[PDB]
Structure formats: structure tokens, C-alpha cells
Amino acid sequence: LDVKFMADTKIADSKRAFELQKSAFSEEVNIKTAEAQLAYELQGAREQQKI
Amino acid sequence: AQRDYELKKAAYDIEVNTRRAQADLAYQLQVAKTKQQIEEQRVQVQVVERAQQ
């Protein structure tokens, strides 16, 4: 069991690095996703002006 | 041996939960910023419309 708990800690430290980086990357994806969705209105409203 | 593992787990879980909370709410913040730019132009049409009236 002593070796077991130590093994579980190293698995957790590996988990930690991964989930942390997922979050960092998801922020970037989420940010540019919103822009991609709403750009049609940013341009659409701007074009209604001339129309 | 269990305690030694339990404390690191909780310690790492603080950061994982913290970073997850940030990532989770990161979408709506940009949606607000984007709408901020859009609404300016939506009502800008009113100004141009009134000017021709």
C-alpha cells in the first residue's frame, strides 16, 4: 500500500499538468469561437446602415 | 501513506477546479465584449435613419 499511494500521487501530478493545459487551450478556442459566431451580426448590422 | 496522497490530491484539485472555473466562464465574457461592439452599430442605424427623415 505504501508504494500504491506513491504511485497514485505521480498519476495525479500527471493528471494535473494535462487538465491545466486543456483549460488554457479551451479558453483560446472558446474566445475565437464566439467571434466566429457573432461576426455575421457585426458585419450585418454595419451593412444595414448603408441599406 | 493515505494522508500523504490525500493532501496532494486536494492541493492539485484546488488548481484544477480554479482553472476549470476560468475556462468554463471564459465564453460568456467574450460574448459580452462582442455584443458591446455590435449594439453600438445596431443603434447607429437609428442615427442615420433619423438623419434622412
Numbering used by the authors:
A (entry chain A): 202 to 252
B (entry chain B): 212 to 264
Provide passages from the article that reported this PDB entry.
In this study, we demonstrate that Flotillin1 and Flotillin2 coassemble to form a large, truncated cone-shaped cage whose wide end is always attached to a membrane surface and whose narrow end is sometimes attached to a separate membrane. The entire wall of the cage is without holes and is likely impervious even to small molecules, forming a diffusion barrier that can connect membrane systems. The Flotillin cage is thus well suited to isolate biochemical processes. Through membrane attachment, it also alters local membrane curvature, which could influence endocytic and mechanosensory processes.
We conclude that the cage consists predominantly of 22 each of Flotillin1 and Flotillin2 in an alternating pattern. With a final density map for the overall Flotillin complex at 3.5 Å resolution, atomic models could be built for much of the molecule. The final model consists of Flotillin-1:1-422 and Flotillin-2:1-402. The wide end has a diameter of 32 nm, the narrow end 19 nm, and height 22 nm. The wide end contains SPFH1 and SPFH2 domains at the N terminus. The wall is a single-layered α-helical barrel, and the narrow end consists of the two α-helical layers described above, one with 22 and the other with 44 α-helices. A β-strand from each Flotillin makes a 44-stranded β-barrel inside the helical layer. The narrow end is made by the C terminus of Flotillin arranged in two layers of helices that run in opposite directions and are linked by a β-strand. Adherence to the membrane is mediated by the SPFH1 domains, which penetrate one leaflet of the lipid bilayer. The Flotillin cage, by contrast, uses a hydrophobic surface that contains covalent lipid molecules.
